[PDB]
Design an enzyme around this catalytic site. Structure first.
Site, PDB file in Angstrom:
ATOM      1  N   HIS A  53       0.993  -1.220   0.018  1.00 39.73           N
ATOM      2  CA  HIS A  53       0.011   0.088  -0.169  1.00 39.73           C
ATOM      3  C   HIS A  53       0.784   1.310  -0.039  1.00 39.73           C
ATOM      4  O   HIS A  53       0.250   2.429  -0.427  1.00 39.73           O
ATOM      5  CB  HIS A  53      -0.882   0.038   1.280  1.00 39.73           C
ATOM      6  CG  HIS A  53      -0.356  -0.151   2.528  1.00 39.73           C
ATOM      7  ND1 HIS A  53       0.250  -1.087   3.229  1.00 39.73           N
ATOM      8  CD2 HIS A  53       0.117   1.071   3.418  1.00 39.73           C
ATOM      9  CE1 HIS A  53       0.719  -0.825   4.418  1.00 39.73           C
ATOM     10  NE2 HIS A  53       0.871   0.635   4.430  1.00 39.73           N
ATOM     11  N   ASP A  68       1.315  -9.513   2.034  1.00 37.11           N
ATOM     12  CA  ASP A  68       1.669  -8.005   2.051  1.00 37.11           C
ATOM     13  C   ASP A  68       3.080  -7.720   2.205  1.00 37.11           C
ATOM     14  O   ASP A  68       3.657  -6.737   2.825  1.00 37.11           O
ATOM     15  CB  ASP A  68       0.838  -7.377   3.090  1.00 37.11           C
ATOM     16  CG  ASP A  68       0.543  -5.907   2.820  1.00 37.11           C
ATOM     17  OD1 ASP A  68       1.086  -5.388   1.704  1.00 37.11           O
ATOM     18  OD2 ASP A  68      -0.234  -5.259   3.803  1.00 37.11           O
ATOM     19  N   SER A 114       4.821   3.278   8.563  1.00 35.19           N
ATOM     20  CA  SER A 114       4.382   1.773   8.223  1.00 35.19           C
ATOM     21  C   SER A 114       5.824   1.565   7.852  1.00 35.19           C
ATOM     22  O   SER A 114       6.384   1.919   6.936  1.00 35.19           O
ATOM     23  CB  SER A 114       3.405   1.680   7.138  1.00 35.19           C
ATOM     24  OG  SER A 114       3.219   0.486   6.812  1.00 35.19           O
TER      25      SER A 114
END
Lengths: 50, 412, 163, 442
Positions: free
Chosen positions: C40, C62, C114
């Protein structure tokens, strides 16, 4: 049976009063009115011979 | 046989107008009224002005008021090639003729040739499915309809009437300075002249001299007939009074007979898989009628005249050909496909393809599509499971693969 | 106090931010000769060597990973699987490891942090922060870690928000 | 005993069946239809033929003026022409120069040849199929004419037979029919009054011996030629002759299902379509107890010859061991094969050879001999003759010509794909469970 005419007198169409070899001019007048008649064929056959 | 001849003994012959009467146009004693040609093997039935059979074989014609006769074997007619008279009875001749555009009946009494040509088509009508011009020496007999050679009383009648007043120029004549009307022997006449006032007079066998009217053209002399008939023709004036006086039956009507029809050479029939071939060698032109014995007949109809080869298709539901005057031959197919149904998979496909063409293509297409989808989906699930095996072990920073999951998933 | 200084001294050269038109949205990790980087977070690598590579993808775990060359494998983070429960060091202070779950007290946590690895009292990476979910007063983390067998386990609580 | 069966409508080919009342001996029935007709209700409307233009003699008046009189003849045309100057053979007919007047008259009447050469326009509806049966009920024969309606039985020796209604109401005859010269044409003629010139129906007449005839033949009187006596006319050439030139082939050449169109009653014979159900009412006096007939045990069947042909291309042997010597009936209750025999005479011990006809490449049918049931199994081979001259003595089946090789190439490529996809599913499930199982420890 069928009744043919030559005047106001009915006769059977197998026994004619006249024949062509006797009186030729009057058999055509005999066959004049007898065309609208179911016994024209028998009248002509009887007028063929005596 | 006087019983059916005396009816035409009380008529007459007459003269009427023809178109081609060997020089120009004229009044011919053999004027043809009608030519009905509907019998099969070439029999036509003329109607003329002159009469026939009145004595064995003679023809009886008018000639300018007076009646003559000749033997019938000096009368000749022809359409395109010569014809042959069979018989005659009253106004009606029976002949046998090839096809043509016209008919010329002719004879020759003195060194003066009489003729009459009328443009009426004569046609030759064959019997059967095989078209000939002259009937064969042999064959089979079919039901045909030709004009009956006899003369019997049947349903048909024609009407004979009184003749009209025939005019006569020859009858009028001249004195020193007068005009004399001389009737023939034992004969009445009526005379009409228009030189002074208006004159309508009748004589009975009296040669009368007229004092006035000093030209031949001032007077018209007619003739009177009282004990005879003529046919109800358009070529004759009609008499006063509406009496038809009678009618006579016609000879030579059409009846049911038997005619010999030709028979074609037999075909040479060769068979194939769901097929019949035909080698056809006609003598004269010949119809070929074929149809199938199923719900859709798909019939075929063809006039064949030269040598031909006609490959047809015969299914398991039947097929039928008619060749010429032969009966129908029926054929039926059975299951002989090219190939071996018991192995070698490139042979069973061709067997069940020549047997059922559409279903084999459809079934192999759907089986190949099912097999393709199944192999592609199984390979997709195999790659999915290999990714799902090796995804946790590759994200580790040690980068090792255990013993079982290395070789079984081709991890290296 | 000194814990943030130790995090800044350990993660000085080995941590590279991800730029997206001047915005810092994520951080990659160089450990074990591997370059971990999430899905992302989209952008360009600030390092020139790590940007001109090809990263194999794993959308279920991910993670994008690559091969660090041999001239940089010594200057990486350390990694281990032996972890007890209790306290660990994080860039904004401390993080609690209870019942196999990483929990962070509230006040901190936004969009952009993140990919920060979780360190211990010795200096080894035990987890990689990927997401977080607000639970009452004390938020929980959705991270990845390893085990004794060697299987990368991704722990994800209910209704997490990606950072 | 009530017994109902179903015979296909096709003449020539035999049909065999047996009655099985339980405690009695089986009775063979063999019925061969000789001729199958189809007679429609046929209603005459009018007849037609060639015409014949009757021309009346020209009435001529010199220096006068004729007048037209009506006669109400069919298609009767009348016109009067002035200024004509006619000629006879013996000079001029008038003396005037002008003011002469002549009447031409023409009308249409039937030909002299109508009683032999004509056509008939009919109408068709409500056909009744009628059949000739050659029936063998228990080795006794009779030739039988039966009506296929839902009634009208036939009775011989107490046996009662009612041919059921045809499954199909098809007829080769349309609404309108023309019979000419023995053949029957499926033409659409105009009604009595709508006859148009040049085509079929320009002359109409209710019967051959009628008296009132319609004529619309487009008759026009023209002017006679200057100096001649004739009636000139000009009309359309005959509709009957033009129909004869432009015929399609007759209905005995174009009708489907192999119908044979015959003349004298209008009918179609031996036309193979549909199926004719039957029904029997058999008295109990023609049956026989089982113990007075050969009852058999331990019968086995092997196939000697097997060719899937249209005729009887199979030969099979039944090896039996009966109890008495006599005849008994044989029958295949399925549609796989059709026996030729229908009655096999047996001894106390031996073999019985029967003749069948099948279309299966791998036949497997349950044969009934006297009161038992054997199973004949073999392999058939293709014939070599491509075209035969007799029809097909059996009934085709779907999956009838499929070989055991073809079943193998269907099955191993159609179920094997399912095997591959289900082991893909099991492999994916085992991989998912293993990877989720190693995840549980954390």
């Amino acid at each position: 049976t069928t009744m043919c005419l030559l005047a106001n007198v009915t006769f059977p169409c197998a026994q004619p009063p006249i024949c062509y070899d006797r009186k030729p001019a009057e058999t055509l007048a005999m066959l004049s009115v007898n065309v609208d008649n179911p016994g024209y064929d028998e009248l002509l056959e009887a007028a063929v011979k005596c | 046989t006087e019983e059916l001849f005396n009816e035409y003994k009380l008529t007459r012959p007459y003269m009427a107008r023809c178109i081609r009467c060997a020089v120009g146009s004229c009044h011919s004693p053999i004027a043809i009224e009608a030519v009905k040609s509907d019998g099969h093997d070439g029999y036509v039935r003329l109607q003329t002005s002159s009469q026939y059979g009145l004595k064995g074989r003679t023809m009886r014609y008018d000639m300018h008021g007076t009646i003559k006769e000749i033997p019938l074997h000096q009368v000749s007619l022809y359409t395109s090639r010569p014809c042959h008279i069979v018989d005659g009875h009253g106004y009606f001749l029976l002949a046998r003729c090839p096809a043509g555009d016209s008919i010329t009946m002719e004879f020759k009494k003195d060194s003066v040739r009489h003729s009459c040509s009328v443009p009426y088509e004569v046609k030759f009508n064959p019997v059967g499915r095989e078209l000939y011009t002259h009937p064969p020496e042999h064959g089979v007999e079919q039901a045909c309809q030709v004009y009956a050679h006899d003369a019997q009383n049947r349903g048909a009648y024609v009407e004979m009437h009184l003749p009209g007043s025939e005019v006569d120029s020859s009858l009028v004549s001249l004195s020193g300075s007068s005009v004399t009307v001389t009737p023939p022997d034992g004969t009445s006449a009526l005379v009409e002249c228009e030189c002074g006032g208006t004159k309508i007079s009748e004589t009975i066998n009296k040669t009368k001299q007229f004092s006035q009217c000093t030209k031949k053209e001032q007077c018209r002399a007619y003739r009177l007939q009282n004990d005879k008939w003529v046919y109800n023709s358009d070529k004759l004036p009609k008499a006063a009074g509406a009496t038809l006086k009678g009618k006579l039956h016609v000879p030579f009507l059409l009846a049911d007979g038997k005619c010999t029809v030709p028979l074609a050479p037999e075909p040479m029939i060769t068979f194939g898989f769901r097929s019949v071939s035909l080698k056809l060698h006609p003598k004269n032109p010949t119809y070929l009628i074929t149809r199938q014995l199923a719900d859709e007949p798909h019939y075929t109809h063809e006039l064949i005249s030269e040598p031909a080869v006609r490959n047809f298709t015969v299914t398991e539901k039947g097929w039928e050909f008619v060749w010429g005057n032969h009966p129908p031959k029926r054929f039926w197919a059975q299951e002989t496909a090219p190939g071996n149904p018991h192995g070698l998979p490139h042979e069973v496909i061709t067997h069940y393809y020549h047997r059922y063409p559409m279903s084999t293509i459809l079934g192999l297409s759907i089986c190949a599509a099912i097999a393709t989808v199944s192999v592609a989906a199984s390979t997709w699930l195999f790659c999915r499971s290999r990714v799902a095996c090796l995804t946790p072990y590759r994200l580790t920073p040690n980068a090792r693969i255990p013993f079982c999951l290395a070789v079984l998933c081709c991890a290296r | 106090g000194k814990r943030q200084r130790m995090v800044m001294k350990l993660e000085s050269d080995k941590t590279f931010p991800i730029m997206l038109e001047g915005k810092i949205n994520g951080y990659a990790c160089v450990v074990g000769g591997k370059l971990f980087r999430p899905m992302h977070v989209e952008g360009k690598i600030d390092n020139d060597v790590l940007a001109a590579l090809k990263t194999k993808k794993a959308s279920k775990y991910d993670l994008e990973y690559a091969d660090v060359p041999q001239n940089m494998r010594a200057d990486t983070f350390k990694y281990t699987h032996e972890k007890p429960q209790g306290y660990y060091s994080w860039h904004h202070g401390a993080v609690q490891y209870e019942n196999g779950r990483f929990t962070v007290p509230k006040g901190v946590g936004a969009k952009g942090d993140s990919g920060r690895p979780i360190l211990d009292n010795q200096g080894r990476v035990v987890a990689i922060v990927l997401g977080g979910v607000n639970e009452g007063s004390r938020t929980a983390l959705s991270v990845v870690m390893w085990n004794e067998k060697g299987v990368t386990v991704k722990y994800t609580p209910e209704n997490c928000e990606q950072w | 005993y009530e017994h109902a069966t179903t015979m296909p409508s096709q003449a020539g080919i035999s049909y065999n069946t047996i009655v099985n009342r339980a405690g009695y001996a089986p009775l063979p029935i063999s019925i061969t239809p000789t001729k199958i007709k189809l007679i429609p209700t046929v209603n005459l409307e009018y007849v037609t033929c060639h015409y014949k233009t009757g021309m009346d003699s020209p009435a001529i008046k010199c220096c006068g003026s004729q007048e037209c009189t009506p006669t109400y003849r069919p298609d009767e045309q009348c016109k009067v022409f002035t200024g004509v100057y006619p000629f006879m053979w013996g000079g001029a007919y008038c003396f005037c120069d002008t003011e002469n007047t002549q009447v031409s008259k023409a009308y249409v009447m039937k030909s002299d040849d109508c009683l032999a050469d004509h056509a008939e326009a009919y109408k068709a509806h409500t056909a009744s199929v009628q059949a000739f049966l050659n029936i063998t009920v228990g080795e006794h024969s009779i030739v039988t004419t039966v009506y296929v309606n839902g009634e009208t039985p036939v009775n011989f020796n107490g046996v009662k037979i009612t041919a059921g209604p045809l499954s199909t109401a098809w007829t080769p005859f349309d609404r309108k029919i023309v019979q000419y010269a023995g053949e029957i044409y499926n033409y659409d003629f105009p009604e009595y009054g709508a006859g148009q010139p040049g085509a079929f129906g320009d002359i109409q007449s209710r019967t051959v011996s009628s008296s009132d005839l319609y004529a619309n033949t487009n008759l026009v009187l023209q002017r006679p030629k200057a100096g001649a006596i004739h009636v000139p006319y000009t009309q359309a050439p005959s509709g009957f002759e033009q129909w004869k030139k432009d015929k399609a082939p007759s209905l005995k050449f174009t009708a489907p299902f192999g119908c044979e169109i015959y003349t004298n009653p209008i009918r179609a014979e031996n036309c193979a379509v549909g199926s004719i159900p039957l029904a029997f009412d058999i008295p109990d006096a023609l049956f026989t107890r089982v113990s007075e007939t050969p009852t058999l045990s331990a019968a086995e069947c092997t196939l000697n010859e097997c060719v899937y042909s249209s005729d009887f291309g199979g030969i099979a042997t039944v090896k039996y061991s009966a109890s008495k010597s006599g005849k008994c009936a044989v029958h295949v209750p399925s549609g796989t094969a059709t026996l030729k025999e229908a009655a096999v005479e047996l001894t106390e011990q031996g073999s019985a050879t029967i003749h069948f006809s099948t279309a299966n490449i791998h036949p497997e049918f349950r044969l009934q001999i006297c009161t038992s049931y054997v199973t004949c199994k073999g392999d058939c081979h293709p014939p070599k003759d491509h075209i035969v001259t007799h029809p097909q003595y059996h009934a085709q089946t779907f999956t009838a010509a499929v070989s055991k090789t073809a079943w193998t190439w269907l099955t191993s490529l159609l179920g094997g794909s399912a095997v591959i996809i289900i082991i893909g599913l099991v492999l994916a499930t085992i991989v998912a469970m293993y990877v989720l199982t190693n995840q549980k420890h954390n």
